[PDB]
């Protein structure tokens, strides 16, 4: 078998076979040397002693409110701390990207082929005597058994951080622009070739699709008016391929950027809100530039909405998730004197960790109705019956579920969760503890340390035997959450760097793009730097209802 199967190389060292029975570690720039890259250079030893742990930094960020009150109001300071926040997680993502499901060593195929998700860790080699390499049993536990014992919801566990259905659908709408698994090819492949925040879920992945969705007048997107309300256009009008069951009324077959968005009225809510936002920005730009044509109006509005999206994700969405007293800031200037690559490639592991199905409730509570999954699926008439305004008001009040902490996956989505386990295995994912080390975290020494609990720990112990072979995806959902948090440490420490890269890596954040002229003048630039989840709903939903990501 492959001599690297045991993952001997530590601290980001790279393993390479040298003959059938031998390996060498390459410790270049790791800060370590020795056969396994385990011996610290002097400078490294100092850095390691002085560096605070993620749990310590989180404590400091979620306490001392008096300090953060001052910091948040001194702009020079707020910028300085945000600069630390951004740069601390910069050495952690390979960029240019490296590995993929088919390549456990660097290759031009892995670099150049955009159809693959990239990989933060190389796959376990094909011939390893064990699923995770060398430790554990010959077979991993039955995935159904893992799912049922420690993943499936018994009683609904509410998010102690107070996440609402506005947050849950925002998460799903946002991520589905860049997690677009090409199931025809396999779980290691994506259809989102832009690899980030390009708003293809609004505009379409291809030029053919975009041009079918565009009005070609005033930069705008096609729409229909139903009962005085602006909604996305139909499949029939646009000839735009969408996923719908045969039994759906023509006018409820909405055509939008992402093909799967008719699946959920909650997703259509955001599709409609964003469509309106685009057309609203078109109106503003036309007033500012009566000289501009349709093409420049469209393209400029698109860049602005990309900007809006990133502003909201950092300052409202990530801000909410973080639980910090410090106010995070979207400001591209902060990296201008740093070393940062303005590029991104979506990691398979980012896709995996983002399977936050425990967010979903048992019923979808709108006005006085309580919709089950069956009746809520594919049913856009619910959106039109209640209206966007009542959707917002209802979803702002309904609490979402806790993600970490175990046993909170709705049984309606049990097949998706089993698939996450099975697909992790198909893609030869390394173990939880390997991923923890990869992201500078101490490996868990027991199952009880993982869960911070006794019952699920015992069930996991009997299923896996060894903590070093525990799988990543189920570990994220059973992990001991931070104090009164939705997530555990592993979710945040893996998730933050992928996120930073996807948000700040966008070309509009680069020195040559981050200029008022890029966005049609100071008015366009202003739209971005004033955007909030509240302003988005206020400007596009009748009656400007109050909204937020928390109940």
Ligand X SMILES: CC/C=C\C/C=C\C/C=C\C/C=C\C/C=C\CCCC(=O)O
Ligand Y SMILES: *[C@@H]1O[C@H](CO)[C@@H](O)[C@H](O)[C@H]1NC(C)=O
Ligand Z SMILES: *[C@@H]1O[C@H](CO)[C@@H](O[C@H]2O[C@H](CO)[C@@H](O)[C@H](O)[C@H]2NC(C)=O)[C@H](O)[C@H]1NC(C)=O
Ligand U SMILES: *[C@H]1O[C@@H](CO)[C@@H](O[C@@H]2O[C@H](CO)[C@@H](O)[C@H](O)[C@H]2NC(C)=O)[C@H](O)[C@H]1NC(C)=O
Ligand V SMILES: *[C@@H]1O[C@H](CO)[C@@H](O[C@@H]2O[C@H](CO)[C@@H](O)[C@H](O)[C@H]2NC(C)=O)[C@H](O)[C@H]1NC(C)=O
Ligand W SMILES: *[C@@H]1O[C@H](CO)[C@@H](O[C@@H]2O[C@H](CO)[C@@H](O[C@H]3O[C@H](CO)[C@@H](O)[C@H](O)[C@@H]3O)[C@H](O)[C@H]2NC(C)=O)[C@H](O)[C@H]1NC(C)=O
Count of CA atoms in the C-beta half-sphere (13 A) of 412: 16
- Residue 520 CA to residue 289 CA, distance in Å, equals 8
* Candidate ranges 19-27, 91-99, 144-152, 398-406; the one touching ligand BOG (CB under 6 A): 144-152
Binder of residue 115, out of ligand V, its own copies, ligand COH, none (CB less than 5 to 8 A by kind): ligand V
Binder of residue 76, out of ligand W, ligand COH, its own copies, none (CB less than 5 to 8 A by kind): none
Helix H or strand E encompassing 54: helix 54-61
Q: Does 13 bind ligand Z (CB under 6 A)?
A: no
Q: How far is the CB of 205 from ligand W (least distance, A)?
A: 9
Q: Which of residues 441-460 bind ligand BOG (CB under 6 A)?
A: 455, 459
The dihedral sign for the CA sequence 242, 537, 171, 342: positive
Q: How far is the CB of 407 from ligand BOG (least distance, A)?
A: 7
- Residue 158 CA to residue 205 CA, distance in Å, equals 36
- Residue 78 CA to residue 326 CA, distance in Å, equals 8
Q: Does 6 bind ligand U (CB under 6 A)?
A: yes
Contacting residues toward ligand W, per CB under 6 A: 113, 115, 185, 206-208
> Applying CB under 6 A, which of residues 4, 264, 306, 313 lies at the interface with ligand COH?
264
Q: Does 239 bind ligand V (CB under 6 A)?
A: no
Q: Which of residues 347-406 bind ligand Y (CB under 6 A)?
A: 375, 379, 381-382, 385
Contact 304, 519 (CB under 8 A): yes
* Candidate ranges 34-42, 272-280, 357-365, 410-418; the one touching ligand U (CB under 6 A): 34-42
The residue with tokens 């979207």 is 330
Contact 408, 358 (CB under 8 A): yes
- Residue 50 CA to residue 117 CA, distance in Å, equals 35
How far does CA 506 lie from the centroid of its chain? 15
> Applying CB under 6 A, which of residues 56, 113, 239, 341 lies at the interface with ligand V?
113
* Candidate ranges 148-156, 221-229, 393-401, 426-434; the one touching ligand BOG (CB under 6 A): 148-156
Nearest CB to ligand COH, comparing residues 14 and 362: 362
- Residue 539 CA to residue 280 CA, distance in Å, equals 8
Assign 3-class secondary structure to 246-309. Answer: CCCCHHHCECCCCCCHHHCHHHHHHHHHHHHHHHHHHHHHHHHCCCCCHHHHHHHHHHHHHHHH
Give the residue numbers annotated as catalytic, written as ranges: 176, 354
Q: Which of residues 491-520 bind ligand X (CB under 6 A)?
A: 491-492, 495-496, 499-500, 502-503
CB atoms closer than 10 angstroms to residue 302: 18
Q: How far is the CB of 34 from ligand U (least distance, A)?
A: 6
324 has binding-site annotation: yes
> Applying CB under 6 A, which of residues 1, 2, 24, 36 lies at the interface with ligand Z?
36
Which positions ≥6 away from 499 have C-beta within 8 Å? 318
SS3 category, 475: helix
- Residue 310 CA to residue 302 CA, distance in Å, equals 13
The residue with tokens 């018994």 is 154
- Residue 324 CA to residue 427 CA, distance in Å, equals 35
* Candidate ranges 100-108, 149-157, 163-171, 440-448; the one touching ligand BOG (CB under 6 A): 149-157
Q: Does 412 bind ligand BOG (CB under 6 A)?
A: no
> Applying CB under 8 A, which of residues 59, 64, 342, 373 lies at the interface with its own copies?
342
Q: Which of residues 288-347 bind ligand X (CB under 6 A)?
A: 313-314, 318, 321-322, 344, 346
Q: Does 341 bind ligand Y (CB under 6 A)?
A: no
Q: How far is the CB of 75 from its own copies (least distance, A)?
A: 19
Nearest CB to ligand BOG, comparing residues 192 and 358: 358
Q: Which of 104, 135, 108 minimizes the C-alpha distance to 23?
A: 104
Nearest CB to ligand U, comparing residues 39 and 363: 39
- Residue 207 CA to residue 204 CA, distance in Å, equals 7
Binder of residue 515, out of ligand Z, its own copies, ligand W, none (CB less than 5 to 8 A by kind): its own copies
Q: Does 299 bind ligand V (CB under 6 A)?
A: no
CB atoms closer than 10 angstroms to residue 481: 20
For residue 437 the two structure tokens come to 């080390």
Nearest CB to ligand BOG, comparing residues 152 and 312: 152
Binder of residue 266, out of ligand Y, ligand Z, ligand U, none (CB less than 5 to 8 A by kind): none
- Residue 520 CA to residue 299 CA, distance in Å, equals 10
Binder of residue 34, out of ligand Z, ligand V, ligand Y, none (CB less than 5 to 8 A by kind): ligand Z
89 has binding-site annotation: yes
Residues 186-205 vs its own copies: string with x where CB under 8 A?
Answer: --------x---x-------
SS3 category, 119: strand
- Any bridge partners for residue 550, and if so which? 163
CB atoms closer than 10 angstroms to residue 544: 14
Helix, strand, coil abundance in the chain, percent, nearest 5 = 45, 10, 45
Contact 343, 197 (CB under 8 A): no
Q: Which of residues 480-539 bind ligand COH (CB under 6 A)?
A: none
289 has binding-site annotation: no
Q: Does 206 bind ligand V (CB under 6 A)?
A: yes
For residue 88 the two structure tokens come to 């601390």
Count of CA atoms in the C-beta half-sphere (13 A) of 464: 26
Binding residues for ligand V, rule: CB under 6 A, are 113, 115, 185, 206-208
**Residues lying near ligand Y in the complex (CB under 6 A):** 375, 379, 381-382, 385
Binding-site residue numbers for substrate are: 89, 324
Which positions lie near ligand Z, rule CB under 6 A? 6, 8, 34-36
User: Which residues are near its own copies by CB under 8 A?
Assistant: 3, 14-20, 24, 26, 28-29, 94-96, 98, 103, 105-109, 111-113, 194, 198, 207, 288-292, 296, 299-300, 302-303, 306, 337-339, 341-343, 507, 510-513, 515-518, 520-521
Q: Which residues are annotated as a binding site for heme b?
A: 357
């Amino acid at each position: 078998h492959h001599p690297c199967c045991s993952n001997p190389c530590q601290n980001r060292g790279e393993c390479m076979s040298t003959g059938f029975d031998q390996y060498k570690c390459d410790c270049t720039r790791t800060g370590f040397y020795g056969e396994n890259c385990t011996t610290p250079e002097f400078l490294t030893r100092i850095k390691l002693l002085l560096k605070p742990t993620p749990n310590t930094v989180h404590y400091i960020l979620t306490h001392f409110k008096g300090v953060w009150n001052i910091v948040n109001n001194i702009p020079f300071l707020r910028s300085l701390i945000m600069k630390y926040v951004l740069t601390s997680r910069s050495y952690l993502i390979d960029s240019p990207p490296t590995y993929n499901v088919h390549y456990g060593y660097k290759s031009w195929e892995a670099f150049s082929n955009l159809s693959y998700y990239t990989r933060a860790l190389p796959p376990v080699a094909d011939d390893c005597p064990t699923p995770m390499g060398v430790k554990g049993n010959k077979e991993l536990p039955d995935s159904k058994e893992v799912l049922e014992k420690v993943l499936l919801r018994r009683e609904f566990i509410p998010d102690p951080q107070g996440s609402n259905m506005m947050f849950a659908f925002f998460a799903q709408h946002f991520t589905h622009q860049f997690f677009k698994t090409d199931h025809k090819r396999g779980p290691g492949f994506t259809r989102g070739l832009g690899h980030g925040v390009d708003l293809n879920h609004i505009y379409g992945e291809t030029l053919d699709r975009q041009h079918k969705l565009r009005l070609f007048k005033d930069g705008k997107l096609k729409y229909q008016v139903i009962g005085g309300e602006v909604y996305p256009p139909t499949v029939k009008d646009t000839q735009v391929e969408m996923i719908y069951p045969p039994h759906i009324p023509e006018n409820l077959q909405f055509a939008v950027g992402q093909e799967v968005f008719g699946l959920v009225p909650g997703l259509m809510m955001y599709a409609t809100i964003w469509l309106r936002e685009h057309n609203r920005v078109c109106d503003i730009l036309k007033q500012e530039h009566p000289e501009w044509g349709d093409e420049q109006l469209f393209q400029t509005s698109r860049l602005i909405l990309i900007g809006e999206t990133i502003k909201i994700v950092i300052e409202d969405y990530v801000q909410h998730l973080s639980g910090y007293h410090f106010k995070l800031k979207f400001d591209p200037e902060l990296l201008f004197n740093q070393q940062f690559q303005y590029q991104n490639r979506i990691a398979s592991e980012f896709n995996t960790l983002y399977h936050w199905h425990p967010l979903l409730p048992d019923t979808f509570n709108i006005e006085d109705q309580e919709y089950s999954f069956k009746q809520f699926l594919y049913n856009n008439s619910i959106l039109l019956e209640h209206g966007l305004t009542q959707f917002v008001e209802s979803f702002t009040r309904q609490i979402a579920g806790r993600v970490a902490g175990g046993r909170n996956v709705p049984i309606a989505v049990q097949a998706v969760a089993k698939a996450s386990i099975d697909q992790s295995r198909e893609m030869k994912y390394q173990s939880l503890n390997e991923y923890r080390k990869r992201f500078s975290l101490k490996p868990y020494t027991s199952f009880e340390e993982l869960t911070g609990e006794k019952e699920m720990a015992a069930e996991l112990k009997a299923l896996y035997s060894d903590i070093d072979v525990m799988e990543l995806y189920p570990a994220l959902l059973v992990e001991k959450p931070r104090p009164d948090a939705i997530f555990g440490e592993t979710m945040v420490e893996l998730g933050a760097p992928f996120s930073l890269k996807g948000l700040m890596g966008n070309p509009i954040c680069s020195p040559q793009y981050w200029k008022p002229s890029t966005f049609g003048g100071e008015v366009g630039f202003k739209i971005i730097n004033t955007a909030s989840i509240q302003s988005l709903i206020c400007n596009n939903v009748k009656g400007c209802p109050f909204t937020s990501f928390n109940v």
